[PDB]
């Protein structure tokens, strides 16, 4: 026997959990690209195609606009390995090249009403095989209604949303879980 160190297990994810055969085709294409072009962009896109669906979150035309707002990205292609949905709050879009896994009808209309293009990842692989002039943006995994509840509300400093199953009080003063440990009146309030 031997006093072992930890036997290596690779943390990284190397198989698409997606059940869509066309997502699997894209994983095949970008395995090829991350091997025989070997750019950081191609390796990143391969990672993100592997990612489960929680971790390739939806992203808005507002995020596309915020990414491309700088004059440096006049010809760049905004790449999101995600479903792209439209921010109704965004009114005037610039002509933008945007590659994604899916564009909502609204996002596609908003991007093609400004003269932009809605690219699929195979089109991106044939246009920029090295992913040059491609602005990768992800999408935010906080702000989830689960992430807000993560932790404990009764822990001082943790501002976790208490788990309320289906009970949405109508009187916000006589709400559920708002009295003892929520006001110093009731002998203590959870610290901030």
């Amino acid at each position: 026997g031997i006093d072992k160190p930890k036997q290596y297990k690779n943390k990284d994810k190397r198989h698409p959990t997606a059940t869509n055969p066309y997502i699997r085709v894209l994983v095949k294409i970008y395995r090829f690209l991350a091997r025989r072009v070997a750019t950081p962009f191609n390796k990143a896109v391969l990672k993100r195609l592997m990612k489960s669906r929680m971790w390739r979150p939806r992203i808005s035309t507002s995020r596309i606009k915020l990414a491309m707002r700088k004059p440096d990205k006049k010809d760049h292609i905004c790449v999101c390995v995600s479903h792209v949905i439209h921010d109704d709050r965004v009114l005037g879009l610039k002509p933008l090249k945007v590659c994604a896994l899916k564009f909502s009808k609204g996002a596609r209309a908003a991007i093609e009403s400004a003269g932009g293009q809605c690219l699929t990842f195979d089109q991106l692989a044939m246009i920029t095989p090295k992913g040059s002039k491609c602005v990768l943006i992800r999408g935010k995994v906080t702000r989830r209604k689960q992430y807000k509840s993560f932790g404990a509300p009764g822990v001082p400093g943790s501002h976790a949303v208490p788990k309320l199953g289906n009970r949405k009080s109508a009187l916000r003063g006589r709400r559920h879980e708002n009295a003892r440990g929520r006001r110093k009146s009731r002998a203590f309030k959870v610290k901030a």
Binding site: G154, K163, G173, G181, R186
Partner: protein, 51 residues
């Protein structure tokens, strides 16, 4: 209960007998979501003009 549901175990607030909610129903929107609600033909023919 202390750790996962602080505000349990108490009673706070004015209790309202026969709480009507239809006279309190009030869905709100924002100014950011207004110009989406105008056919942009109007939004274009009214841009600098007075109407």
């Amino acid at each position: 209960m202390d750790k996962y549901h602080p505000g349990y175990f108490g009673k706070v607030g004015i209790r309202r007998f026969h709480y009507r909610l239809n006279p309190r129903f009030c869905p709100t929107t924002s100014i950011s979501r207004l110009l989406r609600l105008v056919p942009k033909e109007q939004l274009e023919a009214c841009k600098g003009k007075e109407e």
